[PDB]
Scaffold this active site. Sequence first.
Site, PDB file in Angstrom:
ATOM      1  N   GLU A  17      21.761   6.757  13.549  1.00  0.00           N
ATOM      2  CA  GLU A  17      22.283   5.431  13.235  1.00  0.00           C
ATOM      3  C   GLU A  17      22.788   4.799  14.528  1.00  0.00           C
ATOM      4  OE1 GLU A  17      24.572   4.561   9.836  1.00  0.00           O
ATOM      5  OE2 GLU A  17      24.344   6.544   8.915  1.00  0.00           O
ATOM      6  N   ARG A 230      24.287  22.016  10.123  1.00  0.00           N
ATOM      7  CA  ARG A 230      25.115  21.158  10.957  1.00  0.00           C
ATOM      8  C   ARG A 230      25.784  21.978  12.061  1.00  0.00           C
ATOM      9  N   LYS A 240      34.033   9.004  13.566  1.00  0.00           N
ATOM     10  CA  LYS A 240      34.116   7.771  14.343  1.00  0.00           C
ATOM     11  C   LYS A 240      35.515   7.174  14.273  1.00  0.00           C
TER      12      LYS A 240
HETATM   13  N1  LIG Z   1      26.960  17.837  13.125  1.00  0.00           N
HETATM   14  C1  LIG Z   1      25.631  17.718  13.131  1.00  0.00           C
HETATM   15  N2  LIG Z   1      24.866  18.768  13.390  1.00  0.00           N
HETATM   16  C2  LIG Z   1      23.569  18.640  13.389  1.00  0.00           C
HETATM   17  N3  LIG Z   1      22.951  17.502  13.138  1.00  0.00           N
HETATM   18  C3  LIG Z   1      23.599  16.392  12.843  1.00  0.00           C
HETATM   19  C4  LIG Z   1      25.012  16.435  12.835  1.00  0.00           C
HETATM   20  N4  LIG Z   1      25.421  15.233  12.525  1.00  0.00           N
HETATM   21  C5  LIG Z   1      24.356  14.477  12.374  1.00  0.00           C
HETATM   22  N5  LIG Z   1      23.276  15.180  12.568  1.00  0.00           N
HETATM   23  C6  LIG Z   1      21.937  14.681  12.451  1.00  0.00           C
HETATM   24  O1  LIG Z   1      21.855  13.584  13.291  1.00  0.00           O
HETATM   25  C7  LIG Z   1      20.901  12.698  12.818  1.00  0.00           C
HETATM   26  C8  LIG Z   1      21.519  11.335  12.652  1.00  0.00           C
HETATM   27  O2  LIG Z   1      22.890  11.354  12.334  1.00  0.00           O
HETATM   28  P1  LIG Z   1      23.653  10.004  12.086  1.00  0.00           P
HETATM   29  O3  LIG Z   1      25.079  10.328  11.851  1.00  0.00           O
HETATM   30  O4  LIG Z   1      23.318   9.048  13.120  1.00  0.00           O
HETATM   31  O5  LIG Z   1      23.114   9.577  10.646  1.00  0.00           O
HETATM   32  P2  LIG Z   1      23.959   9.661   9.277  1.00  0.00           P
HETATM   33  O6  LIG Z   1      23.346   8.794   8.303  1.00  0.00           O
HETATM   34  O7  LIG Z   1      25.404   9.496   9.480  1.00  0.00           O
HETATM   35  O8  LIG Z   1      23.671  11.125   8.816  1.00  0.00           O
HETATM   36  P3  LIG Z   1      24.836  12.168   8.740  1.00  0.00           P
HETATM   37  O9  LIG Z   1      25.494  11.716   7.504  1.00  0.00           O
HETATM   38  O10 LIG Z   1      24.174  13.449   8.575  1.00  0.00           O
HETATM   39  O11 LIG Z   1      25.580  11.983   9.998  1.00  0.00           O
HETATM   40  C9  LIG Z   1      20.512  13.189  11.461  1.00  0.00           C
HETATM   41  O12 LIG Z   1      19.394  14.037  11.523  1.00  0.00           O
HETATM   42  C10 LIG Z   1      21.721  13.999  11.127  1.00  0.00           C
HETATM   43  O13 LIG Z   1      21.427  14.760   9.962  1.00  0.00           O
END
Ligand SMILES: Nc1ncnc2c1ncn2[C@@H]1O[C@H](COP(=O)(O)OP(=O)(O)OP(=O)(O)O)[C@@H](O)[C@H]1O
Length: 492
Positions: A17, A230, A240
């Site tokens: 995002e 994760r 955030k």
């Molecule tokens: N702590 C983490 N460990 C591994 N991967 C992660 C982690 N947090 C986010 N990701 C992965 O990073 C990518 C994007 O995360 P982002 O936060 O930008 O999207 P999001 O919609 O908030 O998804 P999420 O809710 O999983 O954070 C996705 O593949 C997400 O699943």
Amino acid sequence: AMANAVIGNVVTRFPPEPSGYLHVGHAKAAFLNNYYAQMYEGKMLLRFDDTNPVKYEKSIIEDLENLGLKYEKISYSSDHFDLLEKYCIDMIKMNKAYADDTGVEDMRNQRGEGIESINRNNSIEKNLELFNEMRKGTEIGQKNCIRAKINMQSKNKCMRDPVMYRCIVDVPHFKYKCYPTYDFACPIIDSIEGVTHALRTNEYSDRIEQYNWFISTLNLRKVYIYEFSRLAFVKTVMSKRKLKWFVENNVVDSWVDPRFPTIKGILRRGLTKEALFQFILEQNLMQWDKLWSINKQIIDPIIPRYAAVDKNSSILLILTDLTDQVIQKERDLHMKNKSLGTCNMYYNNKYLIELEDAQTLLENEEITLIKLGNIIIKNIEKENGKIKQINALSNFHGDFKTTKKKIHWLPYLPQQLITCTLYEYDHLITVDKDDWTNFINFNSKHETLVYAEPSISSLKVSDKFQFERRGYFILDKIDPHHHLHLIKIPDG
Ligand SMILES: Nc1ncnc2c1ncn2[C@@H]1O[C@H](COP(=O)(O)OP(=O)(O)OP(=O)(O)O)[C@@H](O)[C@H]1O
Ligand SMILES: [Cl-]
Ligand SMILES: [Cl-]
Ligand SMILES: [Cl-]
Ligand SMILES: [Cl-]
Ligand SMILES: [Co+2]
Ligand SMILES: [Co+2]
Ligand SMILES: [Co+2]
Ligand SMILES: [Co+2]
Ligand SMILES: [Co+2]
Ligand SMILES: [Co+2]
Ligand SMILES: [Co+2]
Ligand SMILES: [Co+2]
């Protein structure tokens, strides 16, 4: 495990995002996407997931660069809103989707109790009317969402008519007045972008059945889902909102603070991308200590070694048999790695040693000055209780092997010694994981002023090195009057 993966035909995608800065968890995701792509000689897409309205693109791209992760093409979720609308309408015409004006609370309790909404049976033409109200942004449309018609009695709550489309007029992205949900947008966009293996976190594994249902119901080309866990760390905030609070309240002075788990943050802290990747491969909240130990094992064989003493605890040692003439000798930056090259060592009759070392000596003990030679301590001048000066005799050709006590040192050449500040950081919080500000270490930036060897002038910003018997450091900044700011790298 990448189902039916074929060399040269794997496509993954990293879908961050664009609403924040990448952190270390993002890095595990971006790296696993790249790793499976490379394993099968395929492609990794970069997709900015702007599915719902809320400019970090540059930060994200810069962090992907800094980790050495390349991608074949950049897209946005919103690039496909038109097509998603078309598909929503197709699903209404197949009686696989319907317009529901039921309120949120009653929808959730109806879902929990398997109760079909009265709108589930809406006619196609009524469903289409209401979707158009949603598209126009009318009060009617704002009362409605589009749900999929799957199976309300399914033991999988994600199959109980998940929302597909919502009317959002409140906030800007004002071009569209209805927006697909993430659950509907993700399988469709993955299919039409040519993804073959869509990587996703462990959390909510129930959604795979839903995702496949969307693909097959629309007769789209299939996409495999791979799941990974994760990456989260003890004593670390990744919200955030919390990070925002830290910044706004002047607890840190920027989003690149070396206590932050942002990619920028921990690269500033001394982490190598190789260390992070290897940690991910060879490994709930993780402990930082194996990550920093892997970093130590990676960096120790390939970084120079310099010396530094505390600028104000350090004590004057005098080899009384030498003159004040400054002798210069070439030496190796790394004793076990001749490729890093040589620097210049300077010596005289006057030296600075650490006070913790100077308090440990006694008359006529023999010790070694590293990279120089042995010396016989002769007198310890203690003025006013504390050690004021140490007098010794050179013994540079004596056998250092016969000495259990080898110490580091600086030549007392103040117009040549480089002044530095050592920043040692700690965790911003004190527990592992609403009054949360009660658990902040508001004092997690310890500074120490030191002198360092003249040859350390050769370093450029971001170079890593070791201070003899002190630890590992990265050159963060260079001040006016050639004053350096060095961050201690944790070593596990
Ligand atoms: N702590 C983490 N460990 C591994 N991967 C992660 C982690 N947090 C986010 N990701 C992965 O990073 C990518 C994007 O995360 P982002 O936060 O930008 O999207 P999001 O919609 O908030 O998804 P999420 O809710 O999983 O954070 C996705 O593949 C997400 O699943
Ligand atoms: Cl919901
Ligand atoms: Cl995993
Ligand atoms: Cl402050
Ligand atoms: Cl800073
Ligand atoms: Co190859
Ligand atoms: Co943007
Ligand atoms: Co209104
Ligand atoms: Co710790
Ligand atoms: Co002289
Ligand atoms: Co000699
Ligand atoms: Co502390
Ligand atoms: Co300064």
